[PDB]
Amino acid sequence: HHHHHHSSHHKEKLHTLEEFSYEFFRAPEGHLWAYSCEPLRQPLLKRVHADVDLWNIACEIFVAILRYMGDYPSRQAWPTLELTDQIFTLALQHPALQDEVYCQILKQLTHNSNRHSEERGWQLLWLCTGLFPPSKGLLPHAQKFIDTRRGKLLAPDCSRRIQKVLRTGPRKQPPHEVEVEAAEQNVSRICHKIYFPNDTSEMLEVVANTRVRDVCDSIATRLQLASWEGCSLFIKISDKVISQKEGDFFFDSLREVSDWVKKNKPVTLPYQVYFMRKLWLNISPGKDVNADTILHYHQELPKYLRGFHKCSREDAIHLAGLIYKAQFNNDRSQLASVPKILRELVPENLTRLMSSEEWKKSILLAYDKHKDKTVEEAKVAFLKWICRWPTFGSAFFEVKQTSEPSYPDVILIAINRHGVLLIHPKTKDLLTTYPFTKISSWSSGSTYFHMALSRLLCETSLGYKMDDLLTSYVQQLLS
Amino acid sequence: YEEGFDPYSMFTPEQIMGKDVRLLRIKKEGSLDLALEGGVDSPIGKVVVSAVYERGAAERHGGIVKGDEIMAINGKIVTDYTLAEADAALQKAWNQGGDWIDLVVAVCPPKEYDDELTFF
Ligand SMILES: [Mg+2]
């Protein structure tokens, strides 16, 4: 009867695990099914008790629950996240511990006359219901436990979270720092800030079972995008920008990346979450103007300014006019000091081509042609003029190649719709193109990237990024 | 570390051509926490340091970083070892006797490129 909402029209006696404990709890070696400040010496359940070596983890879980609730008879300072990691981590890995965690929490919530302890216990049940459900046998007891305590602040949300986690499956990672902070505030609603390439941000509503794709769906509606195909969330952490897997739970992804960053580059690390375009497949500037002016222009502009493309003096003057218009609109006084602004208008490999006044004069003449355009129209014109370049819509990597004596030691690599592009950093010429149809394999380490088509070997700290983009592009092109 | 170390006394020139070869004497205290990658089986055909974990012994010494190549462990040349073989040799010669570990490393040179581009 999980599918139903039950009502009698009046308050029912508080449901406990007393009757459940007669059949499924081990014998006591204060009730074993009721609150106690005494640490457990053996696990509660007969199933868990019948399995030695699971005894120590079950006891360590109870000690961490006692510590979280403040029932442990000391003040030997504990950060909350370490306690929540101890309570839930091994339960996620060994599902036999999941009913044990629920029974230990419900036990500490039964006949608990200590309001602070009881409040903290409900925060644990709230975190727990967002990770995994109780088993088929325990579910009616946990449901009744919550149903008969509907007036508890977090109780209706615990009931909803069990329905949700049964629908989407369990979490892979224990509570995230953000989830724990909300729990400790007795707040069930969470908003995470999401940053965009156009220097803006939005607050996005997230829950325990929110997947990366759900956040993206909400962002596409919020930004009035025609589609988010090829976009994703990214974590800017340490000196990295890492994409998040669309099918992963948002809080699982945050922890997994933070853990990966800790082992690959050695407290909770600060981070930012960005929403950006990842795959540049079928990008037609003007088709989705909101996507072009929020994402596309602002992602393509810094790659252009770095001087990754092959372009002429005349190309740079023309694009600098559009860039000036996109940034300053009608304000013609921003080119007053050429050294303070030229790096925002012209690719760094081309600034030496003419003097400061010559750039200022040529840019102003170009800019003056956009008097009738809006800022959005300038951004779209910028994109339309560069969208057919073979290096448009690319991720770039500067590497030390060790496989081709005919090429310079340091080369520029572009990964995009056309496959892998090898670029001369001085001339910006395309050395070669490795199309996806010719690539037979690739692999990476933390210090290298290798590709087989006819082999490319290079020194890079960004092999994981190269691998991920190649996989993503290949998976998208196939069907 | 040892100042008087000459790589030409241990390797033939073909084995060290274009490498900055140094000897490091690391004092055995705590866990090494030095991760490796590569191997003779891999695309790079050599054993390199993949990570140096915060805990120490490798990090505490300071002379070993990500990208450096492991050429020898306690006098035994490991340039032709698989990753599993290099890992086993490093774990063995750390536990099995001695107050210290002797690592011959090819120090990775400065990167004349931006190794941290973050654009998509
Ligand atoms: Mg001139």
Numbering used by the authors:
A (entry chain A): 0 to 9, 1605 to 1623, 1639 to 1875, 1882 to 2068, 2075 to 2100
B (entry chain B): 433 to 552
What does the paper say about this structure?
Myo7 is a crucial component of the tripartite complex that maintains the necessary mechanical tension across the cadherin links. The Myo7 tail domain consists of two MyTH4-FERM (MF; myosin tail homology 4; band 4.1, ezrin, radixin, moesin) domains separated by an SH3 domain. Both Myo7a and Myo7b MF2 domains bind to harmonin-a PDZ3c with similar affinities via a novel mode.
The basis of the harmonin-a PDZ3c/Myo7b MF2 interaction was determined by solving the crystal structures of Myo7b MF2 and of PDZ3c/Myo7b MF2 complex at 2.44 and 1.88 Å resolution, respectively. The majority of the MF2 and PDZ3c interactions occur between the FERM domain and harmonin-a’s C-terminal polypeptide chain (545YDDELTFF552, hereafter referred to as Cter), with relatively few contacts between the F1 and F3 lobes of MF2 and the PDZ3 domain. Binding of PDZ3c to MF2 results in a buried solvent-accessible surface area of 1276 Å2 (484 Å2 from PDZ3 domain and 792 Å2 from Cter). Two aspartates, D546 and D547, are involved in hydrogen bonds with Myo7b R1921 and S2082. In this buried environment, the negatively charged carboxylic group of the Cter interacts specifically with three residues of Myo7b, K1918, Q1914 and W1895. Thus, Myo7b MF2 recognizes harmonin PDZ3c via a new binding mode.
